[PDB]
Symmetry: C3
Subunit: 292 residues, 3 copies
Amino acid sequence: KIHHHHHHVIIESRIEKGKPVVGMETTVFVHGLPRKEAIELFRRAKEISREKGFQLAVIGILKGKIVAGMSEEELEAMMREGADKVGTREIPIVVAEGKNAATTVSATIFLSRRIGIEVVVTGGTGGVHPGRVDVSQDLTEMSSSRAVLVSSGIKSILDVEATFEMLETLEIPLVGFRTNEFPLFFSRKSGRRVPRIENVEEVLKIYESMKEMELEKTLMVLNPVPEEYEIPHDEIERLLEKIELEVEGKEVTPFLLKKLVEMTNGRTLKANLALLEENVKLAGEIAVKLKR
Amino acid sequence: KIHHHHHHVIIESRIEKGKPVVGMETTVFVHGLPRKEAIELFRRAKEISREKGFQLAVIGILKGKIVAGMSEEELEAMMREGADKVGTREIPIVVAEGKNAATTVSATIFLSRRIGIEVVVTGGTGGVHPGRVDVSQDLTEMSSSRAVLVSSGIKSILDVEATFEMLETLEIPLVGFRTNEFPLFFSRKSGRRVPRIENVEEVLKIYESMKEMELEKTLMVLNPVPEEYEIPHDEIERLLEKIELEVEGKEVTPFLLKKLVEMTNGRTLKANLALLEENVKLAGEIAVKLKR
Amino acid sequence: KIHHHHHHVIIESRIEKGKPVVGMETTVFVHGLPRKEAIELFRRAKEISREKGFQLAVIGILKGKIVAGMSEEELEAMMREGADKVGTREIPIVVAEGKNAATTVSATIFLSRRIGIEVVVTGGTGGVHPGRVDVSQDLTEMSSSRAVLVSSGIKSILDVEATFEMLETLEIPLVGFRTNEFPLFFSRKSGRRVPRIENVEEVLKIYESMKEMELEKTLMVLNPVPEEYEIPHDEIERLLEKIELEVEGKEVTPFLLKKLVEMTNGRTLKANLALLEENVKLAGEIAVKLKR
Ligand SMILES: [Mn+2]
Ligand SMILES: [Mn+2]
Ligand SMILES: [Mn+2]
Ligand SMILES: [Mn+2]
Ligand SMILES: [Mn+2]
Ligand SMILES: [Mn+2]
Ligand SMILES: [Mn+2]
Ligand SMILES: [Mn+2]
């Protein structure tokens, strides 16, 4: 029971232990959206948190300090000063070097697991990229760390078959929130089936069962983009076919997403914002009921 | 020290802890064999268990309840009522929803590890399928959970080279029971070599060493199909090349196995039953000696 | 808390109290170098250790016994008598059978972690081989076990892109020692970027941060070959293209390095020896400062 006393890794948690909490990544705000819409979303998520009675804990690293529950001003400062995009393996160097960093899903789940946050929300996870050599730390983290992650499936830029198959391989359980269709970020339909659940109570029973059986995996609760905003995948696919990928590593994802906003004259941005907002609502409902 | 109390995940063990025990999956009985042969195999295995002095604990999920040591009547009910095929990640879903489920090797090792069963028997494990995107949870579980698994290698429908290579990558130790040839389910030879051991005592020395050095991996003890039933691999390969794969996910394996039974007029079925029965015998000898 | 008492796994540690320690593999000496050069290097590395104030613990298995801190005379016996090349999964097998074995990086990190050695030194790690189905245990180990590993990157015979991507996927942190370029064993130049650190104090900060945040991964400290011994990678590649790979499994790596010694007229042997010696120095500096 007697654990080590930290010196180098300073965590500043603004989260009340006795109150529902949803963790959220910073890279969506810093690298995944334009500034104006990024701050509008933050504000809207905070509004939803007040409406529903949960704490929204945006997670980032500010000059080497891990902050759970960043403020708007902190997020603006981060965007203005610049911040590396970090997954799990990058957390140590940025902490050691005293840098700003915006977390992906992998780092966000990793850190959430160490500060008592069980429900995390994102837009879409990383996965296996076309070519099947470039593979997100997100998959590794979900195979290693227990949480409930609300998402609209996996990002549209990915090798869908390879990612969906590897989620099975890695023993990452999936459930569709009121759908049997694995969602694909901008798109509702994938033609891949998942088990359907009808309410948040069912999520909690699965998750509690995972705990009892010591299954240390992320539960993916899949929440499709609202129909009104969806862009059918057949349409996204074809745009992706025109884009020469000029970059690698962590720039790949931001690069393609920014290109798709340009190409669809903002349609993908509208979709992305809509699903992020819906996902925050669902994540909040889960966090509120978990806390009972 | 102090562990949680289970509420959702009810395990009914019919094992006497003081007697030797071998765990066995349900999917082979429910999805991998025809009913008549499945029940005759179950009865023959129990007979062997009584003759050699170990308990055969067939593991499955009945209306959400984990049963270790299913009866012939329970297995018949499962067949009649239907059961999901479940690997590890699916256990929580079926427990939560109160469904029947027949376990694969992954789920069976995972549960065995939580209920004190150290020896598991199968016919052939899953692996990397042709195309190398579809990969069994069996590999992940074997790379995560310690047990002694007796099998006749990996199923003949797999990408043999990719699977054999990944077993090494994942640090999954393989030993031939009185052979240096990696077996391939219906076939005695794969063309690949493994280290050989001579007896059950040598298996247990490896296993005990793994415990002492905290190597949490499955030890695969390889037992070839009897020579009078074996089918040369090239024959199976040529048949498989004539099958259009009309299914995906969990259906792939039972689909291909059923097609091969039809194409070989039961030749593969007789091989499969032969190797299952011999594997039960070897697993029971290990379980009996382990018990001291 | 109370741990088990060992019976089967005898570990003989020659490490003394009150002294920094660096762990080192045996397969380099046994399978990776000619006899004369290997014994020469062992003596040199010992000299560096006495002069700099650390213990160099060459790890191997002598007739089933794990020895940390082998003598010259033991190494010589091992070469004369023969030793299996073993990664992690093979340790229990050779321990049980009472065989000599020379450890790879995987086995060396695994063992080091169980005997309190935190700094390990090698020349180059394994990785993803061309074709991408053969993948070293080294990668799995580094994604499972915490240590500081000094190497000159990954061996030149590997699929460099695949390996480099998989290091990210598995969450293996990398830092360049006074370089931003990922080294390639005989070559300094990969065109692949890593974060640059300037001194051993920076290494220790990153490593201590990893402990505090429960990141159980190997930290790769990347030390390029000295410029006077460097061979351009394209030159190495051109030569590898002229080789028919006539072998599989563990034999691949030594088979190809030997061929390169032959085709290059000792040139790779000389580079190999120089980087191993420089890596020993760096690992010793790390070990000494860690202990404080
Ligand atoms: Mn503001
Ligand atoms: Mn439990
Ligand atoms: Mn990537
Ligand atoms: Mn131990
Ligand atoms: Mn063939
Ligand atoms: Mn599959
Ligand atoms: Mn800590
Ligand atoms: Mn290999």
